[PDB]
Amino acid sequence: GDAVRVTSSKLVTQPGTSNPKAVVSFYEDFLCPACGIFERGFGPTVSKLVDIGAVAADYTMVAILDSASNQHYSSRAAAAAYCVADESIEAFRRFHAAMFSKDIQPAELGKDFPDNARLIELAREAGVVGKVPDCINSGKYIEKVDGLAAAVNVHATPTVRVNGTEYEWSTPAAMVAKIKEIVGDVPGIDSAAATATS
Template identity: 35%
Template sequence: MSQKNRDGKGRARDRMREEREREKAAERRMRSLKVGGTAAAILAVAGVIGVLAANSGGTSNEGPPAAPITVGESTAPATLAVYEDFRCPACGQFENGFRDVIHELTDAGKLKVDYHLVTIIDGNLRGQGSTNAANAAQCANDQGKFSPYHDVLFENQPAEADDAFADKDLLIDLAGQVDGLDNETFRTCVADGTHDEWAQRSNADFMNSGFNATPTILLNGENLYGNTSEPLTPDTLRNKVNQLAASS
C-alpha cells in the first residue's frame, strides 16, 4: 500500500473517531437532560419547583411589563400568580393536580389567577414550542377562551424534549376541542405570531423577577410551591384560599 493510501485511511479513521466522540457527547447530553427532567418531575410531586431557567435567551425587556392573563373576578380576595411554561413537565403535573380546585375557587369568586407564561424551555432545549403555545394561548384569550384552551394544551402536553408545539397547525387543531375557538381570527393570530413579542416580554419579566424555575406559584405574594416541609396540595390550597376569603 502506498504512503498516500495509508495517509488517506488514517485520516478517515481520525474522522470516524471524531464522529464517534461527537455522538457519545451528544448521548451524554441527552442522558443529562433526561435525568434532569426526571428529577424535576420527582421534585414537582413533592411540591418543589421544577424546571430551572438556564440558558433561556436574553433577559432584556424593552417596553412595559407584559400583563398576565387573568382568570376570575377582579374582586376575589385571593390572587394566585402562576408562572409556567407549556413545555414544562413539572408545570403539567401542577396543572393536572390542581386544575379542578383552581376552577372550583375561581368559579366561586374566591380566587383570581394571574397566568405569567414563560418560554424558558425554548432556550434550555432549543425550539419554538413554548413561544408558539404562549402566543396561541393569548390568541384564545382575545376571544375569551383562554382557560379551556390552556387546559387543553396541558392535557395534550408533549414530552419535554419533543418540540411538538412548534407546529402551529397542531395548536390550531387543538383549538377544535374548545367550543367556538377554531375560527379564522384565531387561526390567523396563531399563524402570524401576533403575540410573540408579548410572550418574549413575559419571559423576560420572569427572568428579571428573581424567580428561577417553573412552576412558580404565589398566593397573595407568598411562594407556596417550593416548601418541602409543607408541600402544597389541592386541599391546602383550598384551605388557604377559604381562610383568605373568610377574613376579607
C-alpha cells in the first residue's frame, strides 16, 4: 500500500540511504488481458533485475475493470494480492505471477471467475496461509483496491513508471537498457539483458 515493493538483499541504493536507485512501478489489473501478456513477457526479466539488485519493482494492483458482471473479480483478486503481500513478499511474487499465467487469468468478458476460495487456494499454492483466508473473506482490502486508480491517478493498464516518470515500454531488452542507463553496469545486468532475449 499503495504499492507492494519487491526487492532482494542486493538492491542497489542511493548513496547514504536505503532508497533504491531505480524503482520500476507497475500499475496492473488482474483481469486485463494486456497485463497478462505484459507480465508473461516481462516477468522473468523483472525478476532477474530484482534478484541482482538493479531495481525495486513496485506493483499497484488496481481494480479498473471490476464489475458485477465479472463477480467483482478485479477487486477481489487485487485485494487477495495485498493480503498475500502481508504474509510474504516472496509469496506475493509467486502469487502475482500465477494470477497472470495463461491457465489462471480468466477471460475479460467471460462468465467464469475465480471465487474467494480459489484465490485463497492460489495463495496457499504461493506458499502462505496465515491471515490470508480471513483477510480475503472479510474483504479487508476491497475498499483500498477500489480506490487505488483514483489514488495514484492511473486510469489505464498496464502502465509503467521508472523513477516516477511515465515509461512507454517496448521489449524486456529495452527495459534492461533503460535501467542500465540509470544504475550503470552493475553485476548481473548484462545477464538480465540475456534473460530478456530468452
